[model samples]
Target: DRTGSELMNSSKLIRMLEEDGWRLVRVTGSAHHFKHPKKPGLVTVPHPKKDLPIGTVKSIQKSAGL
Candidate 1:
């Protein structure tokens, strides 16, 4: 399990979410969007070119139900 403090980029997180059953839906602006088949709402992740900040990582983790 992640502590929500791990260093992560969009590609890594996307793969992780995919492993957890999240589906890549589409893109909005520069962010890659995801959705769970049994969950509501979307999880938006930026491109994998760079690492995300801690705050953003935590926010994404929360949205991802991580």
Candidate 2:
């Protein structure tokens, strides 16, 4: 759930990823990243949480086990 300009930026990123052969899989935790269906890789956008503006979203590196 993004708001204001954040939502707009997120939507743009999603479109960009799709154009680059990526797709949104599942939102694990609170991050702006997606997993590649055929590749063992991840595509991420820098989205810090509202509460932790300086902190980053939960990335694949952090959620490797889950």
Candidate 3:
């Protein structure tokens, strides 16, 4: 039922996920990894522009629950 998610930088996404119960697992190259305490799998996509691209945000959303 969610829609129109906004684009965001990876650091920002990291913060958001942490607030939602995720922890910063690692950072390989540009990718900052995060996994929720109750979840498996990581949310990947370290991004640019500070604003980031829509697709990057979408990918994170898909991996980590938008």
Candidate 4:
């Protein structure tokens, strides 16, 4: 079993968000920004890293409604 399953990549994160109707609005620096019709403001997922930081991942998870 994978113990660090909690640490995920940006690709997977983008997929999950898209599944929830999050659309990519822009790409700034290394971060990929997204927007949702029902949600206010933008959600950003900094990426290209295989294992993103825990704090950032957790934050994204919360925004992902998980």
Best by TM-score: 1
lDDT of 3: 0.61
Q: Which 10 successive residues of model 4 have the least lDDT summed?
A: 1-10
Kindly give the stretch of ten consecutive residues in candidate 2 with the minimal lDDT sum: 52-61
Q: 1-66 in candidate 1: lDDT tens per residue?
A: 257744435545467767877787996666667898887968776654655555665677787874
Rank all candidate structures by their lDDT, best first, as comma-separated numbers.
4, 1, 3, 2
User: Which residue pairs of candidate 4 clash?
Assistant: none
The Cα error of candidate 3 at residue 14, in Å, is: 5.0
Off by over 4 Å in 4: 1-11
Each prediction's TM-score versus the true structure: 0.63, 0.35, 0.56, 0.62
* Residue pairs clashing, model 1: none
What local lDDT score does residue 35 receive in model 2, on the 0 to 100 scale?
70
Write one digit per residue (lDDT tens) for candidate 4, span 1-66. 146634334555567777888888896776668888786857777666565445656677677664
For TM-score, candidate 2 versus 3, the one ahead is: 3
TM-score: model 3 vs. ground truth: 0.56
lDDT of 3 at 14: 55
- State in Å the error of residue 14, model 2: 6.1
* lDDT of model 3, residue 12: 61
